[PDB]
Amino acid sequence: DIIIATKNGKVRGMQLTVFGGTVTAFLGIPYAQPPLGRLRFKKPQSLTKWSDIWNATKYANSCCQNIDQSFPGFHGSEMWNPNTDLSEDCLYLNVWIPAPKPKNATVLIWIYGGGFQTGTSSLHVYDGKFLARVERVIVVSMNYRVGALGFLALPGNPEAPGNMGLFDQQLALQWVQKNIAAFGGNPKSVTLFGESAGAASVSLHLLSPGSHSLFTRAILQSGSFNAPWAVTSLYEARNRTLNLAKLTGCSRENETEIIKCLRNKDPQEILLNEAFVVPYGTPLSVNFGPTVDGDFLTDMPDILLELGQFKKTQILVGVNKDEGTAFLVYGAPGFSKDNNSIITRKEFQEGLKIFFPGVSEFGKESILFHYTDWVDDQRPEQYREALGDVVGDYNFICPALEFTKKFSEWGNNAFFYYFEHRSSKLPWPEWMGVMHGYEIEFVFGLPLERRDQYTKAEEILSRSIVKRWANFAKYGNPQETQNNSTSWPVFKSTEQKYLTLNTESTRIMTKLRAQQCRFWTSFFPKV
Amino acid sequence: DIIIATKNGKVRGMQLTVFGGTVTAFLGIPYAQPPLGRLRFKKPQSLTKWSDIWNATKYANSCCQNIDQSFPGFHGSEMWNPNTDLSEDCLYLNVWIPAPKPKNATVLIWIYGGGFQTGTSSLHVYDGKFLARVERVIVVSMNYRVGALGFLALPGNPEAPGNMGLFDQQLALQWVQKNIAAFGGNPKSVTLFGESAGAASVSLHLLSPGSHSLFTRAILQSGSFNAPWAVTSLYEARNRTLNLAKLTGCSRENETEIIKCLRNKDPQEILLNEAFVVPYGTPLSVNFGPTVDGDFLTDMPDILLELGQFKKTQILVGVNKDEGTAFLVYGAPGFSKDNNSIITRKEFQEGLKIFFPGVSEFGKESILFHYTDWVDDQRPEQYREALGDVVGDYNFICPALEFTKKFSEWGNNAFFYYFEHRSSKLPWPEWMGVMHGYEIEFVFGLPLERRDQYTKAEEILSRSIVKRWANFAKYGNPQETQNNSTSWPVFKSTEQKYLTLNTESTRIMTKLRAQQCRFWTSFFPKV
Numbered sequence A, B: 001d002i003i004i005a006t007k008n009g010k011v012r013g014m015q016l017t018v019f020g021g022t023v024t025a026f027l028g029i030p031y032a033q034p035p036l037g038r039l040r041f042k043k044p045q046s047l048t049k050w051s052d053i054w055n056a057t058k059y060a061n062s063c064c065q066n067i068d069q070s071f072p073g074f075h076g077s078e079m080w081n082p083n084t085d086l087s088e089d090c091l092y093l094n095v096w097i098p099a100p101k102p103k104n105a106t107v108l109i110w111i112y113g114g115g116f117q118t119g120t121s122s123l124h125v126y127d128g129k130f131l132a133r134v135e136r137v138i139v140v141s142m143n144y145r146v147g148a149l150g151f152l153a154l155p156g157n158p159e160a161p162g163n164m165g166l167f168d169q170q171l172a173l174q175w176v177q178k179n180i181a182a183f184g185g186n187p188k189s190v191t192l193f194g195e196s197a198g199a200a201s202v203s204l205h206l207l208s209p210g211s212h213s214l215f216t217r218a219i220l221q222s223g224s225f226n227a228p229w230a231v232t233s234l235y236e237a238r239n240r241t242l243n244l245a246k247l248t249g250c251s252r253e254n255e256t257e258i259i260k261c262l263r264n265k266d267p268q269e270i271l272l273n274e275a276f277v278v279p280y281g282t283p284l285s286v287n288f289g290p291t292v293d294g295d296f297l298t299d300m301p302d303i304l305l306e307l308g309q310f311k312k313t314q315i316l317v318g319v320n321k322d323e324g325t326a327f328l329v330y331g332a333p334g335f336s337k338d339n340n341s342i343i344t345r346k347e348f349q350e351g352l353k354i355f356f357p358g359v360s361e362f363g364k365e366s367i368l369f370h371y372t373d374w375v376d377d378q379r380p381e382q383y384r385e386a387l388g389d390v391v392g393d394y395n396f397i398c399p400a401l402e403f404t405k406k407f408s409e410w411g412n413n414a415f416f417y418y419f420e421h422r423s424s425k426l427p428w429p430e431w432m433g434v435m436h437g438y439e440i441e442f443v444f445g446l447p448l449e450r451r452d453q454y455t456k457a458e459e460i461l462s463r464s465i466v467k468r469w470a471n472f473a474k475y476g477n478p479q480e481t482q483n484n485s486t487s488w489p490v491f492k493s494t495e496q497k498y499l500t501l502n503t504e505s506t507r508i509m510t511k512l513r514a515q516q517c518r519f520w521t522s523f524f525p526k527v
């Protein structure tokens, strides 16, 4: 029977049988006062503290959010929807520790993605028990507020300052610093990892001084703050806030009066209305995201990154081969998860208008031109694949490379990966390839469960990746030193070497998407 | 490797490990042409027939339907939502046969509920593998069209005749008659069982001459056609059709022209709009249900039942202790699944207006009067429990008793049960009690899986019920003859004996809800 005295009180965990061993799980530990009533839109408040035991024996509420209902009954999409009740009372975290209790274990802290509008830490593919079991690290994950409730910004106004969700994560990091030692963890050895919006969060923690000493190093999967979807401008932030305000009947003169009006609405009213604060969104739209609040973020992060104002430490960064494809079935004409989505030139062009709504004809023609230099074939899937590549390079890959490039320029080790294995169990069609989000299950070691219809090769690769991530956390160097693995070289802005992760031919390459990324990083912004 | 030659072609099944034995499953066998294009709103068409093997190795598409999203992330509600893609191409059935292949097995055919608006046969609690394993019966289940796509009625007009979903089920019954022998089943021994709207369907099959010879006997769980939600009047049917027609921009002069206009809409457009064809619905509202079509149903079923025009055979009928409670959190004021729902007198009265929208003040006062004869206490949950009882007696229990009473009057054995055990794993709060829908998992033998956190007592009861249902199917007599069970007496209109199903004190009682049901069955209709 396992009970740990945290600084706020005793908590009770539960034993799990994993791989002929035991992992101890503490699910749903509160780390802040529920942000309700007057506390809505505010930075999280610290916890009351209690006597008696808190039973941390089931996942807690997920934060209020809208759920994707494009494919009801379809596991490919539904595996991402929350699996606990939605509630504003959602500020909880989870802790997986090895058994027997580790002496001074390295801690991995997961920050989920979801475009800052969705997400929860209780998803099956974020289960930290395998990592705890296999690498004897401690895994921690937290729920943080999303959408308007997490990122509504009326900057400098503390009734709704912006970046609340980011402060939720930060307060959870503080919790770990203050309490993890009681669980057998080492507060001086904490590695943040996250995917997509979670990875962007991780990159922002590297930039936020308040977070500087709450972690040791950082892993960024398919995301970074400099991705075009990741940061909300102040013009956007205020326009979007005032729009939510009119939509809900909360337009008032004294901005502080808007917030109290919004404080009195149902969560549902807010949620139902946040979709429309943008006149013409994209599938990748982030209505309420990170802003330069002058608190979490002292300045525009592009400036910070460029002038080397960030935590000096190691990073592990990477992307997947077909980042863009998932988004294509969420609005691009002629695309379907139920057919092979062979599209024509005109549908390609209409898809661009969908993904680049405010861009000139010349801008969209340049994308067309750069991405239709057929290779050198006339295959029917030319345009289908070009559009996925367009969406993936622009939104994920090129920003990831650029971040790593600028980060390493200030003299810290960086490691870059290209994940190109497609899950044999992927419920999405073959044309979508190695999708956004689908390295995560390899990272968390789900293929290590033989009872699960992953291939033998998939167990090897997951085992290998799990070891690399773990060695990165413990030692700041993502090698697999024992099974003749390819050695993972540091990413330097000169040669720009990266490691490909796959089941077959693993290797070192250089300058991922070189031409594509000079188009997006250098040319496209002038357009 | 198992392959069965059906009359339409070879099908391939798959082996399942169940309880140290094998069950063979054929999931997703087509039994009709997909009802698409010109076939929308029509009675199902017979199948083309194929060469090569059909792989019946995964559940098929569920039929188009709206999904309950009141409690996103909550297992209590989400366990009922479809778990395969929604598609109009949904006319498929499933077959579980014992291993080794049975010689002449009795067949149970499951018809799911869902208020004729929702439902699918691929739900976890409808898994027929346990029944196949334990009782060596063959279990069959089918998907049938629901909502407007299954029950849109413009009577006598064969472009949309009504009762299409009922004809889907019937065509599936035909499939069994024609093919089950090839699976080791006995077409001369087929028992229909269903819950809620599925049970109402079963009762209508007893009344439909086209179904007379497609089955042997019948089990009706929490439902019958004479329930107030179960049959759509012709005034309602046409008003609702014409309303869907205006909502979708399909109002035309030649009724046949309405249907072609509706034939050309997206399923989604139809689905989105079927909610509003009723000006003031209830939580129990069935917008598009069974009608007297002059085909499946030759006359108003109340008349048929009363004059003894129905299949002469045995029936097993029953209800649960707290049928009504589930519906209370779907619109009654002051109710919540997250608190104890103590409501006051005025909230009780407002709840009545919600559940009896078209009823006079005197009508609603009579309900109030009949259900507030406190017993003889002044407990705070008086009104909360009275409202659940009101909704349960009116909508499920009293109609069930009345059906059994009138059916047995024509000289066939009838057996009535009162299920009063609450699942120890029920995710809904304690106040909701023994809920509508939650005997089903006991019937299908889920507690027989020891790996599943059901209690030992729950395994006993499930084992017992599984045996009773199986003996009923095989022999038309639901006894458990071996383990000193209470003997289940026939329900006669004189004494009206019934069997209570529970974990503790099992027993024979008489005249379930006697006073409540004379109020609803005799008095209330005059009101």
Ligand SMILES: *[C@@H]1O[C@H](CO[C@H]2O[C@@H](C)[C@@H](O)[C@@H](O)[C@@H]2O)[C@@H](O[C@@H]2O[C@H](CO)[C@@H](O)[C@H](O)[C@H]2NC(C)=O)[C@H](O)[C@H]1NC(C)=O
Residues within 6 Å of the ligand: A332, A333, A334, A335, A336, A338, A339, A340, A341, A342
């Ligand atoms: C691949 O599918 C798309 C997506 O939409 C369709 O999905 C199919 C499975 C089918 O059910 C179809 O009825 C459904 O609309 C097809 O694009 C669609 O084409 C139709 C017909 O002109 C248009 O009305 C729709 O606007 C359009 N939908 C989208 C998203 O553009 C596509 O034609 C199909 N092509 C193939 C087989 O490659």
Ligand SMILES: *[C@@H]1O[C@H](CO[C@H]2O[C@@H](C)[C@@H](O)[C@@H](O)[C@@H]2O)[C@@H](O[C@@H]2O[C@H](CO)[C@@H](O)[C@H](O)[C@H]2NC(C)=O)[C@H](O)[C@H]1NC(C)=O
Residues within 6 Å of the ligand: B332, B333, B334, B335, B336, B338, B339, B340, B341, B342
């Ligand atoms: C039990 O809960 C109901 C349902 O609605 C509430 O659920 C609670 C868990 C809480 O989050 C609350 O904010 C939420 O609205 C309560 O009824 C609600 O009471 C509020 C306050 O007046 C009304 O504004 C709502 O109209 C009303 N909802 C409904 C469905 O009527 C109810 O008061 C609560 N009571 C208890 C503790 O027994």
Ligand SMILES: *[C@H]1O[C@H](CO[C@H]2O[C@@H](C)[C@@H](O)[C@@H](O)[C@@H]2O)[C@@H](O[C@@H]2O[C@H](CO)[C@@H](O)[C@H](O)[C@H]2NC(C)=O)[C@H](O)[C@H]1NC(C)=O
Residues within 6 Å of the ligand: A235, A236, A239, A240, A243, A246, A247, A276, A277, A278, A279
């Ligand atoms: C932000 O401000 C306005 C707000 O307009 C929006 O209002 C919301 C309620 C929502 O429904 C959305 O669809 C709608 O566009 C943006 O809209 C334009 O603003 C002009 C006035 O400047 C208005 O007359 C119109 O409502 C609207 N016109 C059009 C054709 O869009 C505006 O685009 C945006 N400004 C930004 C992005 O800074």
Ligand SMILES: *[C@H]1O[C@H](CO[C@H]2O[C@@H](C)[C@@H](O)[C@@H](O)[C@@H]2O)[C@@H](O[C@@H]2O[C@H](CO)[C@@H](O)[C@H](O)[C@H]2NC(C)=O)[C@H](O)[C@H]1NC(C)=O
Residues within 6 Å of the ligand: B235, B236, B239, B240, B243, B246, B247, B276, B277, B278, B279
């Ligand atoms: C069925 O016919 C009419 C249709 O009206 C409905 O129209 C749908 C589009 C839907 O949105 C629904 O909300 C709406 O009520 C029913 O409505 C009434 O009919 C009168 C004319 O007879 C109209 O003037 C109104 O639209 C409407 N009035 C009110 C206050 O309800 C009508 O109730 C129903 N008849 C039945 C049940 O037989």
Ligand SMILES: C[n+]1ccccc1/C=N/OCc1c(F)c(F)c(F)c(F)c1F
Residues within 6 Å of the ligand: A068, A077, A080, A081, A113, A114, A115, A118, A119, A195, A196, A283, A284, A326, A327, A328, A330, A436, A437, A438
């Ligand atoms: C949170 N997340 C991380 C990685 C990969 C996927 C997800 C969530 N996926 O939900 C499915 C989904 C998608 F995959 C989308 F591309 C999209 F635009 C959606 F709106 C959407 F809901």
Ligand SMILES: C[n+]1ccccc1/C=N/OCc1c(F)c(F)c(F)c(F)c1F
Residues within 6 Å of the ligand: B068, B077, B080, B081, B113, B114, B115, B118, B119, B195, B196, B283, B284, B326, B327, B328, B330, B436, B437, B438
């Ligand atoms: C199909 N079914 C059979 C038995 C019990 C429940 C169900 C389906 N339950 O879905 C949850 C649910 C309910 F339990 C309801 F009472 C209700 F009114 C809904 F609209 C609803 F969606």
Ligand SMILES: *[C@@H]1O[C@H](CO)[C@@H](O)[C@H](O)[C@H]1NC(C)=O
Residues within 6 Å of the ligand: A012, A055
């Ligand atoms: C927490 O768990 C234990 C055993 O599961 C229980 O006995 C204890 O009282 C619990 N506290 C609760 C339910 O609040």
Ligand SMILES: *[C@@H]1O[C@H](CO)[C@@H](O)[C@H](O)[C@H]1NC(C)=O
Residues within 6 Å of the ligand: A103, A104, A186, A188, A189
């Ligand atoms: C754990 O490791 C750190 C160094 O990273 C060390 O300073 C600390 O004292 C250790 N705590 C132990 C051994 O419990």
Ligand SMILES: *[C@@H]1O[C@H](CO)[C@@H](O)[C@H](O)[C@H]1NC(C)=O
Residues within 6 Å of the ligand: A254, A256, A257
């Ligand atoms: C806005 O309202 C708040 C709350 O009363 C108050 O502090 C302030 O005086 C108001 N500001 C303006 C501009 O009137």
Ligand SMILES: *[C@@H]1O[C@H](CO)[C@@H](O)[C@H](O)[C@H]1NC(C)=O
Residues within 6 Å of the ligand: A460, A463, A464, A467, A480, A482, A483
């Ligand atoms: C190394 O090799 C052995 C067997 O070859 C394997 O069981 C072990 O898990 C491998 N380790 C890693 C980290 O891949």
Ligand SMILES: *[C@@H]1O[C@H](CO)[C@@H](O)[C@H](O)[C@H]1NC(C)=O
Residues within 6 Å of the ligand: B012, B055
């Ligand atoms: C059906 O299943 C078998 C083995 O699983 C496969 O080899 C056969 O070709 C399948 N037919 C298909 C996939 O259409």
Ligand SMILES: *[C@@H]1O[C@H](CO)[C@@H](O)[C@H](O)[C@H]1NC(C)=O
Residues within 6 Å of the ligand: B103, B104, B186, B188, B189
């Ligand atoms: C199965 O049982 C029926 C009687 O219910 C019998 O007439 C039929 O011939 C049997 N078929 C066999 C033994 O295969």
Ligand SMILES: *[C@@H]1O[C@H](CO)[C@@H](O)[C@H](O)[C@H]1NC(C)=O
Residues within 6 Å of the ligand: B254, B256, B257
């Ligand atoms: C309705 O339209 C159909 C289809 O053309 C046709 O059979 C019939 O003549 C029309 N009926 C009327 C009332 O005009």
Ligand SMILES: *[C@@H]1O[C@H](CO)[C@@H](O)[C@H](O)[C@H]1NC(C)=O
Residues within 6 Å of the ligand: B460, B463, B464, B467, B480, B482, B483
């Ligand atoms: C009868 O009794 C034995 C043990 O007492 C039990 O294993 C068996 O399953 C029981 N049968 C039924 C139908 O309850």
Ligand SMILES: [Ca+2]
Residues within 6 Å of the ligand: A064, A065, A086, A087, A088, A267, A268
């Ligand atoms: Ca909510």
Ligand SMILES: [Ca+2]
Residues within 6 Å of the ligand: A187, A188, A189, A190, A213, A214, A215, A216
């Ligand atoms: Ca540190």
